[PDB]
Specification:
The structure is cut from a larger assembly and holds chains A (about 375 residues), B (about 140 residues), C (about 240 residues), D (about 190 residues) and E (about 80 residues). With about 140 residues, chain B is mainly alpha-helical. Chain B contains six helices and two strands; from the N terminus they run H-H-H-H-E-H-H-E. Chain B is about 65% helix and about 5% strand. Chain B has a two-stranded parallel sheet. By secondary structure, chain C is mainly α. In chain C, about 55% of the residues lie in helices and about 0% in strands. In chain D, about 50% of the residues lie in helices and about 0% in strands. Chain D is built from ten helices and no strands. The termini of chain D are far apart. The chains are: A alpha+beta (about 375), B mainly alpha (about 140), C mainly alpha (about 240), D mainly alpha (about 190), E mainly alpha (about 80). Chains in contact: A-B, A-C, C-D, D-E. At the A-C interface, helix 5, helix 8 and helix 9 of A face helix 1, helix 6 and helix 9 of C. Bound molecules: zinc ion (2 copies). One zinc ion binds next to strand 11 of chain A. The PDB classes it as transcription. Keywords: RNA Polymerase III, SNAPc, tfiiib, snRNA, Transcription. RNA Polymerase III Class III Open Pre-initation Complex 2 (OC2).
Chain lengths: ~375, ~140, ~240, ~190, ~80
């Protein structure tokens, strides 16, 4: 059965059908209303419980098989005043000294050495992107009716690793994560990718730098595919698209290269519901013929009324790692726009140049080529990340 | 990540004391909570992101303490801990407990057992959490 | 876990990847560069020392090979020739070659290194002395423009900086090979440009301009989420920042 | 099977067969004339020759491969004494390298010498004759034996008729030990 | 050490009957008995003479019992 379980502790889980998983979840929630995207009543102090008592006590009595008086006593006993050690007017910026928490002791030890004139700041804690995105999207609703999340829709958290890999660290990975809906097709996710490889350009133009190519790689090549459970999902919507998976299949199945038999399908043929996929287990996505991304399904859960209900933002980026800009070697401060080879002036090969430095080093006022070198346009993946 | 730097010790101490009281009443848990002042944990110069992650991980750890094989009293204490953590947080919107598919039906069965056991305090607290919809319907906690 | 790093699928027996796809071959024919080409490793002093050793070794082989090959040939001919006068002549040539070998062995390393523009066995150096870890052209450039001793490695004097600033304006901050030649301190175009740009008011602006502000605002509004913005990546679009 | 571009072996390891044989032949001839083959199994020596050849023909990559890797690629078992023969032949190569003007200044080593086998074998005859004036022999005996076949003391004397008699009493059992032997293996 | 002492006790009680000593030893073969003899004789010529003079009782049960006990004790302590 489609019963999720760990394959390795807190690293990855058993495979299951996403559609069956969603149906099993909805079966355990349909008719109760806990899954609905409507705002429910909220707990409050006993001093203001009178208004909600009529609506709540009868339901409590029905569900807990207790009397209405017992429901009222339970509501009185479990009031928030028995737990709110903090008044609603207290600011979160100060540690309350009247506490026995070891956690707040450690927090005090952290804050005490961050109050000197050299250390006092309101700077980043450990990262920024997550809360900015959440506050930008959490709890919002769409401006169009067609852009509304359906009730009980599955939210899938998909990590896509960058093509630029560290090659020196292995604990953390360079990745960006989208939330996607079960009913979405893989075409939408692929079209939502803003990877720099689509912007790749080249060609040798040392003689005529203004003749840079008019077409980015996205305009030249549109091949892209996902790979799950041994199945390739190749895009074929446009004539520039080609079935990259066929070459991989021909190469891999001819020898005991360590992988089993695969099968090819179109990208429009499957929704996220149709996938039988693991959580945490790495998978593959590829585009532009050579740009491979590792795919990790970090999380899957049903939509909740506090979540981002605005479809226009989906696939909704939910985490993003950082890459450094390729600073040109001339000034070593500014970001490069060009790269040269066989350069008679550069101290090293390849050498990176900015749009100013390249032009006013390798050319004169009339634009005539100076010295001997080969030069190519460069788009920085650290910039367009 | 696993756990905050210190939360596990405080949670273990509070749950151990609750168990040692040999009582399941919510009154005793609230007395311990107010004596030790657990609710203050969500103050202390935590920025919104720090607060969101801290609430997520605290709720996850409390859910781990709430699941079996822990016995009746300790599970009840962990449910009270979950309730306190969720309802004393300062997030906007409120952060939810991560609940797995393999755990939701077991927790509903525990709610039914609590109702059958005539210990309505824990069942009411869980129903109040459901009214707050404190639970995310995830695959893992 | 970590096995799935790019390339995601890799051969279990030999570690090779798939053959070049048609899209990749067509990209290569168009000359579209890959992101893996931007990986550059800094030159450690150990690499510089090994390069000095490799260049002096190459020059030493180049000087010795003629002399010792002639010595060996003369010794062969002496062994196979029975004529006494010819044997003595061949022995004399062998002794002369031996003395020349000894003289070359006694030459200092500075003489062996020779001039900046002298010829070297660059591709052999790259592929046999460094096992191909750095390309032949890369090694050639690094040596001839930074490592060879005739390059002016000395720190910039204040008079040198002031003259560089003054003379750059005459040429329009342009044609830096001629600027470096006219400066008269044996600097290169790249060194002069690097020094100028690191101390250039026109590059490292303190003021602002209308188009910079407009386009900065445009990129910020496009890409900002909440309190986060791409501070140092917007530097790509507007010129003259870090 | 290195000479075929089979999928099992990377094409990087493929090479022309004729020059393979010429290099192997000259290495084996060097081993033969340098005393390595007499009284010893030739197969390990030929294995070492082929391996140093395969390394020396592409130092850039094949210098990083070990004999286990090469034999795995070839699907040929490697004799255990092949490693010792390879070490001895590399020692011979270092003894040859000490004469050449450039090699002796470059201060080579066991691993680096493999990229000069070409010019070492180009001028083999003169260098090996000069080195022989420094021969090769089993290292077990080359440890500078001060004494060689010492003359033992003369002990051909046999006495007159009997030099001793208590030995016979020493070599016979008492009734106790006689009975003990009877019961030892009963 | 104790193996050599037992071997010396055996040469005392039974003489240079290498076959029976090999048979009573748990594992040692005849060739090993000969090799031990060749190695020890140089420094223990006096001790083998003492053994030949020391015609100690070669009882079966007693020798088996002390063999087993001392072997077990050495194996435990080593
Ligand atoms: Zn990409
Ligand atoms: Zn510049």
């Amino acid at each position: 059965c489609n019963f999720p379980e760990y394959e390795l502790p807190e690293l990855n889980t058993r495979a299951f059908h996403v559609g069956a998983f969603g149906e099993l979840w909805r079966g355990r929630l349909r008719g109760a209303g806990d899954l609905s995207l409507r705002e429910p009543p909220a707990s409050a102090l006993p001093g203001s419980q009178a208004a909600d008592s009529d609506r709540e006590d009868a339901a409590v009595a029905r569900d807990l098989d207790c009397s209405l008086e017992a429901a009222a006593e339970l509501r009185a006993v479990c009031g928030l005043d028995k737990l709110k050690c903090l008044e609603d007017g207290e600011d979160p910026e100060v540690i309350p000294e009247n506490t026995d928490l070891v956690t707040l002791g450690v927090r005090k030890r952290f804050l005490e050495h961050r109050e000197e004139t050299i250390t006092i700041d309101r700077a980043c804690r450990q990262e920024t992107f997550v809360y900015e995105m959440e506050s930008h999207a959490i709890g919002k609703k769409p401006e169009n009716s067609a852009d509304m999340i359906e009730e009980g829709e599955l939210i899938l958290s998909v990590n896509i690793l960058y093509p630029v890999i560290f090659h020196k660290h292995k604990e953390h990975k360079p990745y960006q994560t989208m939330l996607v809906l079960g009913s979405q097709k893989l075409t939408q996710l692929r079209d939502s990718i803003r990877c720099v490889s689509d912007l790749q350009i080249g060609g040798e133009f040392s003689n005529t730098p203004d003749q840079a190519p008019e077409h980015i790689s996205k305009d030249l090549y549109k091949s892209a595919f996902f790979y799950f459970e041994g199945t390739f999902y190749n895009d074929k919507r446009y004539p520039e698209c080609r079935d990259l998976s066929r070459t991989i299949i021909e190469w891999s199945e001819s020898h005991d290269r360590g992988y089993g038999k695969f099968q090819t399908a179109r990208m429009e043929d499957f929704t996220f519901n149709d996938l039988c996929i693991k959580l945490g287990f790495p998978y593959l996505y590829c585009h532009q013929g050579d740009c491979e991304h590792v795919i990790v399904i970090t999380d899957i859960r049903l939509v909740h009324h506090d979540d981002c209900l605005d479809r226009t933002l989906y696939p909704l980026l939910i985490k993003k790692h950082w890459l450094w800009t390729r600073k040109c070697f001339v000034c070593k401060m500014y970001t490069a726009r060009w790269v040269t080879n066989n350069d008679s002036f550069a101290p090293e090969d390849p050498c990176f140049f900015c749009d100013v430095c390249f032009r006013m080093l390798h050319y004169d006022s009339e634009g005539n080529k100076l010295g001997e070198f080969l030069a190519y346009p460069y788009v920085d993946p650290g910039t367009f990340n | 990540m696993g756990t905050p730097p210190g939360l596990q010790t405080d949670c273990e101490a509070l749950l151990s004391r609750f168990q040692e009281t040999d009582s399941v009443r919510f009154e005793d848990f609230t007395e311990l909570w107010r004596n030790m002042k657990f609710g203050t944990i969500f103050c202390g110069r935590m920025r919104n992101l720090e607060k969101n992650m801290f609430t997520k991980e605290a709720l996850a750890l409390a859910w781990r303490y709430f699941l079996p094989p822990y016995t009746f009293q300790i599970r009840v204490g962990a449910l009270y801990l979950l309730y306190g953590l969720y309802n004393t947080q300062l997030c906007q919107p409120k952060q939810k407990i991560r609940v797995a598919l393999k755990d939701w039906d077991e927790v509903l069965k525990f709610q039914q057992d609590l109702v059958n056991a005539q210990h309505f305090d824990a069942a009411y607290i869980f129903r109040k959490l459901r009214l707050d919809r404190a639970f995310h319907f995830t695959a893992m906690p | 876990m970590g096995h799935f790093m790019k390339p995601y699928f890799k051969d279990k027996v030999t570690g090779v990847g798939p053959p070049a796809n048609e899209d990749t071959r067509e990209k290569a024919a168009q000359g579209i560069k890959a992101f893996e080409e931007l990986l550059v490793t800094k030159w450690k002093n150990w690499e510089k020392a090994l390069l000095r050793k490799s260049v002096v070794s190459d020059r030493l082989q180049r000087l010795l090979q003629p002399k010792l090959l002639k010595l060996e040939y003369l010794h062969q001919k002496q062994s196979k020739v029975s004529s006494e006068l010819e044997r003595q002549a061949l022995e004399k040539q062998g002794r002369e070659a031996e003395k020349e070998i000894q003289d070359i062995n006694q030459l200092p390393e500075e003489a062996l290194l020779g001039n900046r523009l002298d010829s070297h066995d660059w591709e052999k150096i790259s592929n046999i002395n460094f096992e191909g870890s750095r390309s032949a052209e890369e090694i050639r450039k690094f040596w001839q423009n930074s490592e060879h001793p005739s390059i002016n490695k000395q720190e910039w004097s204040r008079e040198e900086e002031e003259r560089l600033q003054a003379i750059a304006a005459a040429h329009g901050h342009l044609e830096w090979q001629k600027i470096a030649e006219e400066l008269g301190t044996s600097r290169s175009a790249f060194q002069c440009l690097q020094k100028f740009q690191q101390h250039n008011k026109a590059l490292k602006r303190k003021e602002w301009t209308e188009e910079e502000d407009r386009m900065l605002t445009q990129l910020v509004q496009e890409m900002r989420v909440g309190s986060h913005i791409p501070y140092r990546r917007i530097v790509y679009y507007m010129e003259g920042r870090d | 099977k290195l000479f075929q571009a089979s999928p099992s072996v990377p094409a990087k390891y493929v090479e022309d067969k004729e020059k393979m044989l010429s290099r192997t032949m000259q290495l084996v001839e060097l081993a033969n004339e340098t005393w390595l083959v007499t009284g010893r199994h030739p197969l390990p020596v030929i294995t070492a020759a082929t391996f140093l050849a395969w390394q020396s023909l592409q130092p850039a990559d094949r210098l990083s491969c070990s004999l286990a890797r090469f034999c795995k690629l070839a699907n040929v078992d490697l004799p255990y004494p092949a490693s010792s023969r390879l070490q001895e032949l590399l020692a011979v190569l270092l003894r040859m390298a000490e004469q050449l003007a450039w090699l002796r200044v470059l201060r080579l080593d066991k691993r680096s010498v493999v990229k000069h086998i070409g010019d070492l074998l180009q001028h083999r005859q003169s260098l090996v004759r000069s080195a022989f004036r420094d021969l090769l022999l089993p290292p077990c005996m080359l440890k500078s034996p001060k004494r060689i076949c010492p003359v033992p003391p003369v002990s051909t004397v046999t006495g007159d008729e009997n030099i001793s008699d208590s030995e016979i009493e020493q070599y016979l059992r008492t009734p106790q030990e006689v009975r003990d032997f009877q019961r030892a293996q009963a | 050490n104790k193996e050599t002492d037992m071997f010396f006790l055996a040469i005392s009680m039974v003489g240079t009957d290498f076959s029976m000593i090999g048979q009573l030893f748990p594992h040692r073969a005849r060739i090993e008995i000969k090799n031990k003899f060749k190695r020890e004789e140089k420094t223990n010529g006096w001790r083998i003479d003492k053994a030949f003079q020391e015609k100690r009782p070669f009882d079966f049960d007693f020798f088996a019992h002390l063999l087993q006990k001392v072997l077990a004790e050495e194996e435990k302590r080593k």
